């Protein structure tokens, strides 16, 4: 058996075809087992309609998840990614560094 703690990155990207669009991304990488819970948060509340959840693996024991959706950030709100995994004794909340 092997278990590996996810690395968690939270960032925004504008698709080059539409600069008015902005995506909030949680990139959860290098984890095992594949069991996981990932949410995007706005002001600590789970964002319910996340448009994209892309799972892959490299080696049989390394998984990668890109979890992302359209958003319109303001100065008045806080955005984050929350991850639960067996390797994490408490939920890990990673704030967006703008």
Author numbering: 0 to 97
Quote the authors verbatim.
Here, we report the use of the TPBLA to explore the role of the protein sequence in determining the aggregation of the naturally amyloidogenic protein, β2m. The protein forms the noncovalently bound light chain of the major histocompatibility complex class 1 (MHC 1) and is important for antigen presentation. Another example is β2m, in which aggregation of the wild-type (WT) protein is associated with the deposition of amyloid fibrils in the joints of patients undergoing long-term renal dialysis (dialysis-related amyloidosis [DRA]). More recently, two single-point variants of this protein, D76N and V27M, have been identified in amyloid deposits in the viscera or tongue, respectively, with the former occurring in the absence of kidney disease.
To examine the structural effect of other amino acid substitutions at this site, the crystal structures of seven variants (D76E-, D76A-, D76S-, D76G-, D76Q-, D76Y-, and D76K-β2m) were determined at high resolution (1.15 to 1.52 Å). Comparison of the crystal structures of D76E-, D76A-, D76S-, D76G-, D76Q-, D76Y-, and D76K-β2m with those of WT- and D76N-β2m revealed no substantial differences that could explain their different stabilities and aggregation propensities (RMSD < 0.6 Å over all heavy atoms). For D76N-β2m, the network of hydrogen bonds involving the sidechains of N42, T73, and Y78 found in the CD and EF loops of WT-β2m is maintained in the variant. For other variants, the loop structure is maintained despite these hydrogen bonds either not forming (D76A-, D76G-, and D76Y-β2m), or being reduced in number (D76K-β2m hydrogen bonds to N42, and D76S-β2m hydrogen bonds to N42 and T73).
